[PDB]
Amino acid sequence: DILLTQSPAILSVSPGERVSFSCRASQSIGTDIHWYQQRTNGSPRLLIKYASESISGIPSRFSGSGSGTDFTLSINSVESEDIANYYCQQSNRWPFTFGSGTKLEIKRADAAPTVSIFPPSSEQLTSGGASVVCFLNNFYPKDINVKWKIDGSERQNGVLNSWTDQDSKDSTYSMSSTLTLTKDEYERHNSYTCEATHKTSTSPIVKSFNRN
Amino acid sequence: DILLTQSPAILSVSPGERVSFSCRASQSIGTDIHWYQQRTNGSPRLLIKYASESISGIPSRFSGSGSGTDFTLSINSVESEDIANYYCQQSNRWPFTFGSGTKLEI
Amino acid sequence: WRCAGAATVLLVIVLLAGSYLAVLAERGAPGAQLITYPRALWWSVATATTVGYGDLYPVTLWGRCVAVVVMVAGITSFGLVTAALATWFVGQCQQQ
Amino acid sequence: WRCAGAATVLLVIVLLAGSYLAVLAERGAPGAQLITYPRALWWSVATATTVGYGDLYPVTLWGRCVAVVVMVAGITSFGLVTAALATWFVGQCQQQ
Amino acid sequence: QVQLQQPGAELVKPGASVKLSCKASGYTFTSDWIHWVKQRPGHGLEWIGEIIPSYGRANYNEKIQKKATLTADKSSSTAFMQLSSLTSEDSAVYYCARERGDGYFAVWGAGTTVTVSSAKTTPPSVYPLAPGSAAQTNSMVTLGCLVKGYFPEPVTVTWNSGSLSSGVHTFPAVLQSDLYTLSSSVTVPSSSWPSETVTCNVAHPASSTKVDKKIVPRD
Amino acid sequence: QVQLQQPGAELVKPGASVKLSCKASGYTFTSDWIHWVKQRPGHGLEWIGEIIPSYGRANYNEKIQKKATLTADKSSSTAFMQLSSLTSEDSAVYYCARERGDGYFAVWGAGTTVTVSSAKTTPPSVYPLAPGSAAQTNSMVTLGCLVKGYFPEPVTVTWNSGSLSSGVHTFPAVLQSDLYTLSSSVTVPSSSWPSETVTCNVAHPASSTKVDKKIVPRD
Ligand SMILES: CCCCCCCCCCCCCC(=O)O[C@@H](CO)COC(=O)CCCCCCCC
Ligand SMILES: CCCCCCCCCCCCCC(=O)O[C@@H](CO)COC(=O)CCCCCCCC
Ligand SMILES: CCCCCCCCCO
Ligand SMILES: CCCCCCCCCO
């Protein structure tokens, strides 16, 4: 069976410059290679067929080249919507096989996070639970750290964090940090604070709310 | 003559997990590869013919895959009776040749 | 002229059915290349004309059986088409 | 119709004997691929029809002599089978 | 219109079986092949098998264990994959794809998320996330909703039934005590809220539940 | 039934020759090829040659020295390999195998152990191994037999003519002063012995000897 090597696995690029994805087959497959794009949580989407033939609806910035064993998918001037995983696939010999995929990452300008804190909802409190949610949105680079404080002292238990992949709309990252407690434990304290530390500022970006 | 490389020569595995034996031919031989099992003091026994085709009497845990130069014999969930030496053999070009063998250890 | 037209229809049917059935027979055999319809049609043509470049050929038993039908029915029917064209050409040699 | 049937039998005999004798001739020559009967039968068919894909062929002197017999007797006999089928088809053109 | 239709999710217990469906629409030809592709979270695309509905012949990836059985029904234009005797290794998204017999996958389904687990189906609780009474308003305001305590994956969150697409983040779920939780955020011009409604729509196909929740300022 | 029958052993002196036989049964076709494969102890399989009995043509591995001559006899359905002018390097197990002309070895003989040596054939002495009078009995009891002073290899040891297969170990022989020695062990429920007989059967094909010895408690 044909092995398709996509190397490198991650492609990091500045906006607007040219980028090339490599696909190499373990033996010659003529021009029987096709390229798919898959965005976060999306289905694969056909970009190029038979190595170089364009598909209706695909932007003209996409092209492909090669024959034999070495194949290239090229994007002229990347933009945020091109952030995705890219797969090649061969149809020369049975069975059809897929490459392992290359991720496109974009190097954009630094951006500080927009921090919002949300106290627990009325509906949630009326049934025992209390979740305090903090959004840290549209920052870059992806390195960030969040710190919860209750009445001025750092809180680490009950904290669950989640990070998005790179955003295909503006090349940023976002993160959520949710501190979940009992309603009684929530009702034994006044001040709730999430603190975000990011390379954009030496001082943390701090958002708070008093329960009382 | 076709050289068949079986690497690694010894395969060490925990019981019940999947194991794969590799056979690589010095040139492309289509699907003309066959696999034999030989237990201590026993005769070789045909397991798979033409790379992937099953043999009557061989447990369904055995399967094979590959074409061209790279070939795999797989056992889903090994058990003690699979302890043996495993050989590949090609029939694409004269003369027929054998791989050097892989030992399965549990 | 009517009989030449019937032979051409039979040839096209053989080429199309051979292309469809070759793909059906060859998919599932690792390493088989006769597995998409456009190039299987090219293969059936190269076989019925007896040219047989060998850029494509079947590797399975049932693919090779399909090949035999394409040879038998397709070489006969292409011979009929060829014979008709040679007869028509010999006519206008006489007409000058 | 009786003569078409006799030609078909001769063709099958040529294909089977050619397949058996090709393997016998080719085994012992390092690198020979025409060395198992099923694919040798595929080779004999590709030769008698003159298609000649060339995925398989003999490399020894006696294998190539076997090939010549398959060409001489097999192309003649396949031509006879082909001629009979073309005659039968030309009949129902007349019958319409 | 969507050319291949797949259910969103299937929960199966370890050792049990499931039948996935792929409903085809648009143009159908005798040369069509339906393919099935498996993708485990954070991994690549893995070819499972193919079937030609006009004849019923199916073929299977020989490099992996055969856990699938493919069938088709020409009347309902629906292809099926029977996955049998499943294990945690079979938890994945399963795509179907259409190929016109010329080698490439022109169209793909949305995929069916299969989770193999002994835990039970649980609908999510959706809670609004509105700013506190002391939060200061910039030129934009951020709102959100909290989707807690569901199983299995996935959920789909939209805002105003899809009309609000820009300024939306939905965070990957985090798994806790056999239950998932995620949040979604939306940014709109602070001029527009609450004079113009903003509402999140949370769908959970494994439990066949769909819920709305309007975000209104705190009293 | 066994489809290819080979003698168990042949002793040949250095520089001498021997003729190995392979008696075929079951279905026979004109497409059949008989192959010969050599295996030295602790080594892999080495293809020697092939003959097509329906015609009598034989071919030989060109990468090794030609020490073999293959013939066949259609009346007795027996293939022969003449090994000539032998050396210590020719000591090995020699298998014959049947191939239906389609490339793979569907069936194999049990192999003939050839030893090239100047030493003489010697039958083994078999001794019982019963527990001492002070050995304590668990839920199982271990018995054995001692096979000493034979040449050449091999011997075959069974217990109760094969009916006792589980709980059996036969150890590889050790060579001493031109004589081999091995032991075989068998474990049976201590409830069953000696009320139910246990007997070892030792066969030595090179000397055409077969011996039984019952294991009885010490007096
Ligand atoms: C039931 C269906 C059976 C027959 C269907 C055949 C479809 C033909 C349409 C071809 C689309 C182009 C394919 C492509 O992009 O690839 C081209 C470049 O790789 C090669 O084209 C080809 O293989 C050439 C087509 C066959 C040769 C013509 C012989 C006529 C007697
Ligand atoms: C004296 C005997 C001479 C003739 C014996 C021929 C035996 C035919 C049975 C084939 C068994 C399948 C082989 C296999 O598993 O391999 C297939 C896949 O590699 C290829 O099959 C083949 O090579 C196709 C067979 C020949 C094409 C048919 C032409 C008919 C006129
Ligand atoms: C492997 C599937 C077999 C398909 C064969 C179609 C009918 C062939 C007639 O020659
Ligand atoms: C090498 C063995 C020769 C076999 C030739 C068979 C007879 C050929 C007749 O053309």
Give the DSSP H/E element, type plus range, for residue F48. Answer: strand F46-51
Cβ <8 Å between B94 and D36: no
- Tell me the fold of E119-217: Immunoglobulin-like (2.60.40)
CB F25 within 8 A of CB F169: no
Residues 6+ apart with CB under 8 A from E84: E17, E67, E68, E69
Residues 6+ apart with CB under 8 A from F169: F184, F185, F186
Best residue in B27, B53, B89, B94 to probe D by mutation, most D CBs within 10 Å? B94
Which residues of chain E are within 8 Å of residue A122 when distances are taken between CB atoms? Answer: 218
Question: For residue D17, what is the DSSP state?
Answer: H
- Kindly report whether the peptide bond that precedes residue A141 is cis, defined as omega within 30 degrees of 0: yes
Residue boundaries of the structural domains of chain A: 1-108, 109-211
Cβ <8 Å between C50 and D53: no
CB A192 within 8 A of CB E134: no
Residue boundaries of the structural domains of chain F: 1-118, 119-217
Residue among E182, E198, E181 at smallest CA distance from E142: E198
Interface size between A and C, measured as CB pairs under 8 A: 19
Is E138 exposed, middle or buried (CB count within 10 Å of its CB: 0-12, 13-18, 19+)?
A: exposed
Task: Please tell me whether residue C40 adopts helix, strand or coil conformation.
Answer: helix
- Ligand 3 pocket check: which of C16, C21, C34, C69 to mutate, most ligand atoms within 8 Å of Cβ? C21
Question: For residue F132, what is the DSSP state?
Answer: -
Experimental technique, in short, is: X-ray
CB E139 within 8 A of CB E98: no
Looking at domain A109-211, what is its CATH homologous superfamily? Immunoglobulins (2.60.40.10)
Cβ <8 Å between E169 and A167: yes
Amino acid at D16: L
Query: Dihedral, CA atoms, F86, F89, F94, F99, nearest 10 degrees?
Result: -100
Residue boundaries of the structural domains of chain D: 1-96
Cβ <8 Å between E144 and A118: yes
A196 backbone dihedrals φ, ψ, rounded to 5°: -115, 130
Task: Please tell me whether residue F53 adopts helix, strand or coil conformation.
Answer: coil
Query: Cα–Cα distances in Å, from A210 out to A119, A146, B64?
Result: 9, 19, 66
In the 3-class helix/strand/coil scheme, how is E87-137 assigned residue by residue?
Answer: CHHHCEEEEEEEECCCCCCCEECCCEEEEECCCCCECCEEEEECCCCCCCC
Residue among E28, E26, E24, E32 at smallest CA distance from E6: E24
Cβ <8 Å between F105 and B44: yes
Task: Please tell me whether residue F84 adopts helix, strand or coil conformation.
Answer: coil
- CA D64–ligand 4 middle distance (angstroms): 9
Chains A and F make contact, 3+ CB pairs within 8 Å:
no
CA distance F90 to F25: 28
Amino acid at C72: V
Cβ <8 Å between C38 and E50: no
**D9 pocket-lining for ligand 4 (C-beta < 6 Å):** no
CB B45 within 8 A of CB B56: no
Minimal-distance CA residue to ligand 1 atom 27: C42
Question: CATH top-level class for D1-96?
Answer: mainly alpha
Place of tokens 């096979």: F147
A103 backbone dihedrals φ, ψ, rounded to 5°: -95, 135
Of C3, C52, C75, the CB nearest to D53: C52
CATH 3.65.10.10 fits A1-108, yes or no: no
- DSSP β-ladder status, E156-159 and E168-170: unpaired
Q: Which chains touch C (3 or more CB pairs under 8 A)?
A: A, B, D, E
d(CA C10, nearest CA chain A) in Å: 30
Of E95, E132, E166, the CB nearest to A43: E95
- B1-106 CATH: 2.60.40.10
In the 3-class helix/strand/coil scheme, how is chain A assigned residue by residue?
Answer: CCCEECCCCEEEECCCCCEEEEEEECCCCCCCEEEEEECCCCCCEEEEECCCEECCCCCCCEEEEEECCEEEEEECCCCHHHCCEEEEEECCCCCCEECCCEEEEECCCCECCEEEEECCCHHHHCCCEEEEEEEEEEEECCCCEEEEEECCEEECCCEEEEECCCCCCCCCEEEEEEEEEEHHHHCCCCEEEEEEECCCCCCCEEEEEECC
Residues 6+ apart with CB under 8 A from F216: F128, F130, F194
Task: Please tell me whether residue D81 adopts helix, strand or coil conformation.
Answer: helix
Task: Please tell me whether residue C32 adopts helix, strand or coil conformation.
Answer: coil
For residue E193, how far is the Cα from the chain centroid?
30
- DSSP β-ladder status, B45-49 and B102-105: unpaired
Looking at chain E, which residue has its C-alpha nearest residue A127?
Answer: E125
**C24 pocket-lining for ligand 3 (C-beta < 6 Å):** yes
CA distance A139 to D6: 85
Structure tokens at D87: 């005659």
Which ligand sits closest to the CA of B34? 2
CB D94 within 8 A of CB D87: no
- Ligand 3 pocket check: which of C35, C66, C69 to mutate, most ligand atoms within 8 Å of Cβ? C66
Contact with chain B for residue D28, Cβ under 8 A: yes
CA distance C32 to C55: 12
- CA F20–ligand 4 middle distance (angstroms): 28
F208 backbone dihedrals φ, ψ, rounded to 5°: 55, 40
CB E70 within 8 A of CB E51: yes
CA distance D55 to B49: 21
Minimal-distance CA residue to ligand 4 atom 9: D66
**D20 pocket-lining for ligand 4 (C-beta < 6 Å):** no
Task: Please tell me whether residue C2 adopts helix, strand or coil conformation.
Answer: helix
Residues 18-57 of F with CB under 8 A from B: 35, 37, 44-47
C10-17 contacts, C-beta under 8 A, 24 or more apart: C10/C73, C10/C77, C10/D89, C11/C48, C11/C74, C11/C77, C11/C78, C11/C80, C11/C81, C14/C44, C14/C48, C14/C69, C14/C70, C14/C73, C14/C74, C14/C77, C15/C41, C15/C44, C15/C45, C15/C48, C15/C70, C15/C74, C16/C41, C16/C44
